């Protein structure tokens, strides 16, 4: 990111809600990226941290940010079966048709992982 951007990426990946909130209130770039193009929302979605997902969206995170591998936050939430995070992302305009570099949507991932709950809402 920047100085604050890097701290925000690290705090999000480590699931530190309070640290994320303080960084955002002190002006960190909500769409900071690491070298892979991972954003704070990618990382929070990956680890299933509902609070940080909601805080970042409330500070204007790009719900449909794509990393350099074509993953969106919806993909990563689906990878780990995070139902509530999928619901929240969908409700904030997540793109059900976004494809990664294998041509897969979040739905396709739910199907690969045999997750009937996610499959139902990702169509």
């Amino acid at each position: 990111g920047s100085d604050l951007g890097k701290k925000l990426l690290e705090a999000a990946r480590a699931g530190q809600g309070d640290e994320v909130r303080i960084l955002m209130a002190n002006g960190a770039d909500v769409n900071a990226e690491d070298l892979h193009g991972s954003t704070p929302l990618h990382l929070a979605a990956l680890i299933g941290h509902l609070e940080i997902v909601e805080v970042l969206l409330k500070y204007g995170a790009d719900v449909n940010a794509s990393d350099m591998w074509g993953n969106t936050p919806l993909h990563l939430a689906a990878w780990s079966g995070h139902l509530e995070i999928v619901e929240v992302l969908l409700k904030n305009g997540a793109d059900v048709n976004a494809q990664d570099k294998f041509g897969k949507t979040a739905f396709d991932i739910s199907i690969d992982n045999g997750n009937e709950d996610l499959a139902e809402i990702l169509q």
């Binding site: 990946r13 591998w69 990878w79 079966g81």
Partner: protein, 231 residues
């Protein structure tokens, strides 16, 4: 389903050391960075510490930590690599560069304190002086591959094979057949997998502030089951 997978829930520091000899040209490589096995990500930078790398950086990618592959939840039982940690495993390969020489490699991958360390010895023989390798004719880029993994009950480990595709600067591709074995170092129990594969993606770049011969490597690896209408 392994105590070893618990060591990979966070971002983990990585150190890589390689001692190489290709057709008599001796060289060393150091690498450092981080891995995120939940995401399946590596971010690494490698330096040739002996001067100019006498082979193309792309030929070394496979040799230079499959414990960072993302294994989905339904497949955590098939994750040999992490289960062998922290004591680790020995990773050996022969790599045949078609119409050219071969690399033999032996690596120990294990934790030293909180760092995941890959230490490697590499011996290459029978390279053509003006083939694609010693002639430095490989493009500075990398392809996506499937890495096939089976259990080896006998050696309490796995066997692995795949073919790397290296773009040549004339538009052709140079294949490198990869045969691989992994054995645990510890006496602890490990996971022996059903047959499956890793799907790999990589990008190579340069650090503009780095004055040595070097490679920046970004990698993204996901484990998958065999599916209907493969083979």
């Amino acid at each position: 389903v392994s105590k070893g997978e618990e060591l990979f829930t966070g971002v983990v520091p990585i150190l890589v050391e390689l001692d190489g000899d290709v057709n008599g040209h001796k060289f060393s490589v150091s690498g450092e960075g981080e891995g995120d096995a939940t995401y399946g990500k590596l971010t690494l930078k490698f330096i040739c510490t002996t001067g100019k790398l006498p082979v193309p950086w792309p030929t070394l990618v496979t040799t230079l930590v499959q414990c960072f592959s993302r294994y989905p939840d339904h497949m955590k039982q098939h994750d040999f690599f992490k289960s062998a940690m922290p004591e680790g495993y020995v990773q050996e390969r022969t790599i045949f560069f078609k119409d050219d020489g071969n690399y033999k490699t032996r690596a120990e991958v294990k934790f030293e304190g909180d760092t995941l360390v890959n230490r490697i010895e590499l011996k290459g023989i029978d390279f053509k002086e003006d083939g694609n390798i010693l002639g430095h004719k490989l493009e500075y880029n990398y392809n996506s591959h499937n890495v096939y993994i089976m259990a080896d009950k006998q050696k309490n480990g796995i066997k692995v094979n795949f073919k790397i595709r290296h773009n040549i600067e004339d538009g052709s591709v140079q294949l490198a057949d990869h045969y691989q074995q992994n054995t645990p170092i510890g006496d602890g129990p490990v996971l022996l997998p059903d047959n499956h594969y890793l799907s790999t993606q990589s990008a190579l770049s340069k650090d503009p502030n780095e004055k040595r011969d070097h490679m920046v490597l970004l990698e993204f690896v996901t484990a998958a089951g065999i599916t209907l209408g493969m083979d």
